[PDB]
Amino acid sequence: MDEKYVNSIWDLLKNAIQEIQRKNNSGLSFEELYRNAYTMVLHKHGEKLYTGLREVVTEHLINKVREDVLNSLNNNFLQTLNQAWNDHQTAMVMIRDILMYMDRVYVQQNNVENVYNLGLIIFRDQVVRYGCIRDHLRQTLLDMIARERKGEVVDRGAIRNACQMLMILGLEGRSVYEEDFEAPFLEMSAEFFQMESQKFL
Amino acid sequence: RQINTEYAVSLLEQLKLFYEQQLFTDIVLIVEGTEFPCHKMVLATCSSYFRAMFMSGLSESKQTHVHLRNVDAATLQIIITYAYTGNLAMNDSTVEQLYETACFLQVEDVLQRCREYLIKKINAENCVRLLSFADLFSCEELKQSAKRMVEHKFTAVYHQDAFMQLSHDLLIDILSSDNLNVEKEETVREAAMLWLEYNTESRSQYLSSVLSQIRIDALSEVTQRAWFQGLPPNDKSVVVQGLYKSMPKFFKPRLGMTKEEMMIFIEASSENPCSLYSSVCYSPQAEKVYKLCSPPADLHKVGTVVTPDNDIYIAGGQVPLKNTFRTVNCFYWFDAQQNTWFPKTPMLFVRIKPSLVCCEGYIYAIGGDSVGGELNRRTVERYDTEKDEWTMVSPLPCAWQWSAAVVVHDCIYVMTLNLMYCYFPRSDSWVEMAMRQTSRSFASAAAFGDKIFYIGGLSVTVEIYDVNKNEWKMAANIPAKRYSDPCVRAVVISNSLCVFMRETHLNERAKYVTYQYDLELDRWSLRQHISERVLWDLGRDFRCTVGKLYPSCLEESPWKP
Numbered sequence: 143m144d145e146k147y148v149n150s151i152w153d154l155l156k157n158a159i160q161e162i163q164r165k166n167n168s169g170l171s172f173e174e175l176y177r178n179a180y181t182m183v184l185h186k187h188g189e190k191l192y193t194g195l196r197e198v199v200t201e202h203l204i205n206k207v208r209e210d211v212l213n214s215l216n217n218n219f220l221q222t223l224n225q226a227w228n229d230h231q232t233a234m235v236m237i238r239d240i241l242m243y244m245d246r247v248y249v250q251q252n253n254v255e256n257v258y259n260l261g262l263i264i265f266r267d268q269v270v271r272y273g274c275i276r277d278h279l280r281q282t283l284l285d286m287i288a289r290e291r292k293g294e295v296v297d298r299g300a301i302r303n304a305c306q307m308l309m310i311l312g313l314e315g316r317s318v319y320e321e322d323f324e325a326p327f328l329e330m331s332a333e334f335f336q337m338e339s340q341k342f343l
Numbered sequence: 344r345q346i347n348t349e350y351a352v353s354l355l356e357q358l359k360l361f362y363e364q365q366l367f368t369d370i371v372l373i374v375e376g377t378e379f380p381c382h383k384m385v386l387a388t389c390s391s392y393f394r395a396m397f398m399s400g401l402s403e404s405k406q407t408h409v410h411l412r413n414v415d416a417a418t419l420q421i422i423i424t425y426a427y428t429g430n431l432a433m434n435d436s437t438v439e440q441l442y443e444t445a446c447f448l449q450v451e452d453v454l455q456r457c458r459e460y461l462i463k464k465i466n467a468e469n470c471v472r473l474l475s476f477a478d479l480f481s482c483e484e485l486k487q488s489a490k491r492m493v494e495h496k497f498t499a500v501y502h503q504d505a506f507m508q509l510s511h512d513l514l515i516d517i518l519s520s521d522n523l524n525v526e527k528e529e530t531v532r533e534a535a536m537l538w539l540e541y542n543t544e545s546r547s548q549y550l551s552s553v554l555s556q557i558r559i560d561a562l563s564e565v566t567q568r569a570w571f572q573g574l575p576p577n578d579k580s581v582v583v584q585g586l587y588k589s590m591p592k593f594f595k596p597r598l599g600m601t602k603e604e605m606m607i608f609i610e611a612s613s614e615n616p617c618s619l620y621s622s623v624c625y626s627p628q629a630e631k632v633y634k635l636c637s638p639p640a641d642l643h644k645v646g647t648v649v650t651p652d653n654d655i656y657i658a659g660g661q662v663p664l665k666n667t668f669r670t671v672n673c674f675y676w677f678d679a680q681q682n683t684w685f686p687k688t689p690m691l692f693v694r695i696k697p698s699l700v701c702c703e704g705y706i707y708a709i710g711g712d713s714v715g716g717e718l719n720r721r722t723v724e725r726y727d728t729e730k731d732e733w734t735m736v737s738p739l740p741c742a743w744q745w746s747a748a749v750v751v752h753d754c755i756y757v758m759t760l761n762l763m764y765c766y767f768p769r770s771d772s773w774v775e776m777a778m779r780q781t782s783r784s785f786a787s788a789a790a791f792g793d794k795i796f797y798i799g800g801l802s803v804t805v806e807i808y809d810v811n812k813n814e815w816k817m818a819a820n821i822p823a824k825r826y827s828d829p830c831v832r833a834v835v836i837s838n839s840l841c842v843f844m845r846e847t848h849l850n851e852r853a854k855y856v857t858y859q860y861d862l863e864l865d866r867w868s869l870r871q872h873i874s875e876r877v878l879w880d881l882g883r884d885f886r887c888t889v890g891k892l893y894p895s896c897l898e899e900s901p902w903k904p
Contacts, residue, residue, distance in 0.1 A: 167400060167401060168400075168401075168402065169402055170401055170402055171401065171402050171403060172395075172396060172399065172401040172402070172403045172404070173396070173403055173409065173410070173411060173412075176392065176396075177412065177413055180413070180447055184479065184480075235399065236395075236399045236400070236401070239395040239399050240395075243392065243395075243449060246449070247481045250481065250483070251481050
């Protein structure tokens with residue numbers, strides 16, 4: 143139909159998506175959103191919907207979680223990161239349901255990554271691989287693992303949660319997680335064990 | 344492990360019974376005021392949308408009444424009953440709405456079933472309609488199949504009402520494709536024009552795009568003057584953009600112009616000893632021998648027929664049982680571009696070497712050992728090329744074997760040892776015709792013009808029959824070397840009666856040669872002698888028929904001269 147109708151449909155869908163991402167998914171209808179997605183993709187306007195979804199997701203991430211992680215880099219940094227990851231996953235569940243109904247046709251025709259993969263990629267690009275968050279996370283994980291190796295006991299399930307989060311963020315296998323975690327950890331372990339062997343001999 | 348013997352059937356039947364009695368239901372679907380009480384588990388396991396409808400945490404997950412819109416009541420009811428019993432029972436009319444509702448509800452199994460049903464029912468007319476349907480709801484299989492069917496048939500019709508209402512992308516894909524089955528380049532031009540005359544001033548940019556698509560070979564004929572007649576006033580840059588489409592954009596020859604009139608042969612002498620028979624072709628003009636893929640690749644003793652629209656069909660046949668020759672009533676059709684064989688609706692009786700005759704757009708299979716043990720042994724069965732079904736007709740008057748049948752003046756004619764009957768399609772009855780003075784069998788006849796030429800029989804018997812005169816007469820004897828058993832084949836070539844005969848002697852090699860016969864001369868003039876350097880031996884049970892084929896799609900048969 144006219145551009146006004148599809149623009150209004152997209153505007154209301156974006157408002158609903160933002161409301162869902164704000165931990166307010168209780169009072170929101172699902173049939174209306176699915177019908178709007180049907181009438182949106184049916185008219186061969188999937189590219190606009192995909193671009194708008196990407197823009198909305200990246201704007202929401204940069205506004206909320208990028209500020210939250212940087213604001214709490216010293217007070218439960220890893221706990222806040224895990225909570226943000228869990229919230230992102232639990233919103234992307236429904237987001238991926240709707241936009242995966244869309245994704246069937248879209249990626250069987252346009253040959254692109256699915257919306258779950260798109261969200262994972264944008265999260266990796268905007269949070270984990272940030273210019274400041276990445277180095278801080280590396281330094282804090284190295285510090286806590288070194289302190290654990292020293293002899294004193296620290297939290298261990300949290301490190302497992304972080305490693306699982308990075309492995310899922312890999313999204314293809316062990317390409318990003320292996321490098322980002324192991325390589326600084328490999329160097330730290332190398333120096334630590336070299337010093338330990340030199341002391342022991 | 345899924346034990347299918349006790350629990351599966353019992354569980355499904357008890358679930359169906361619970362659905363009937365409205366027991367243990369917790370969700371009800373509201374469809375334009377109609378209530379459909381059902382269960383969430385069956386909807387989740389069947390549809391990929393209801394699982395998200397009831398699992399994803401939202402306002403409708405905890406909602407006893409859900410108002411689902413944009414869905415038909417009958418389609419949703421049939422989907423629910425298929426989910427509750429496993430049987431679809433789809434008709435031929437409500438397929439489009441059922442597929443639309445399945446796509447909306449994302450029910451994969453019924454989607455695949457409807458896709459197969461639609462891909463099997465692109466017969467003659469819904470091709471463009473279902474092509475647009477598949478363009479609206481992305482379906483690669485349906486899209487490709489409908490595209491091929493359109494390229495085959497619309498290129499001969501190009502006047503369908505549904506074809507006018509098409510999206511620009513689909514029309515561009517259709518027109519720019521090199522699969523147009525058109526022997527001339529102006530028909531596509533006028534088709535594009537008439538597609539751009541009923542909707543003008545609305546698709547002027549798309550008019551220019553289609554104008555460029557049809558390319559210079561048809562752009563330089565009349566399009567400029569017609570557009571000048573029909574252009575909107577005060578349009579200047581449109582003239583500039585239209586004038587540019589004269590030089591560029593790679594003018595190349597099409598593919599539909601290669602409809603060379605050739606001869607399709609079946610059951611030839613196979614080269615590799617692992618195979619028994621093969622189907623090959625001969626080019627009267629190119630003087631080359633092409634090959635074709637066997638339709639079943641294992642079944643033989645088939646019959647051939649060629650419609651006026653140049654279509655190849657195969658019916659009946661026998662195949663070895665391969666235990667550690669059984670008759671099959673299967674049907675097949677030859678693809679003019681894919682070089683394959685798509686099966687069609689099978690017959691009702693397992694015939695041996697059926698004789699298929701085309702008339703009034705219907706395929707008539709006459710005789711050919713129907714079941715043999717019929718109460719009325721002399722029966723026939725025809726085919727519907729539009730409805731895709733077999734309809735019983737008036738049976739044969741007399742039971743005959745090794746008979747031949749042709750069509751003349753839109754009338755069915757079947758020839759036997761000495762008798763001939765004319766079947767009236769309008770009244771569905773047989774009328775007695777003239778009786779031949781010679782009793783000859785194991786021969787075939789050709790329908791050239793308004794005269795039937797029954798050639799051969801056991802020889803060189805040339806008995807010419809005329810429908811308007813209703814009499815049998817002799818013309819001459821074909822010049823053949825003595826002490827030989829010729830294998831005669833009569834068929835129409837380039838609107839001229841000709842024959843294809845092979846002579847075999849003792850301790851001698853077979854020779855292939857075709858002669859040109861004249862009506863008033865009663866002589867078979869030497870037209871062309873088929874050299875053995877290109878064509879090898881065929882056999883004894885080979886058949887010949889006239890048809891047009893594509894050289895590029897087919898492949899040459901490799902054989903040492």
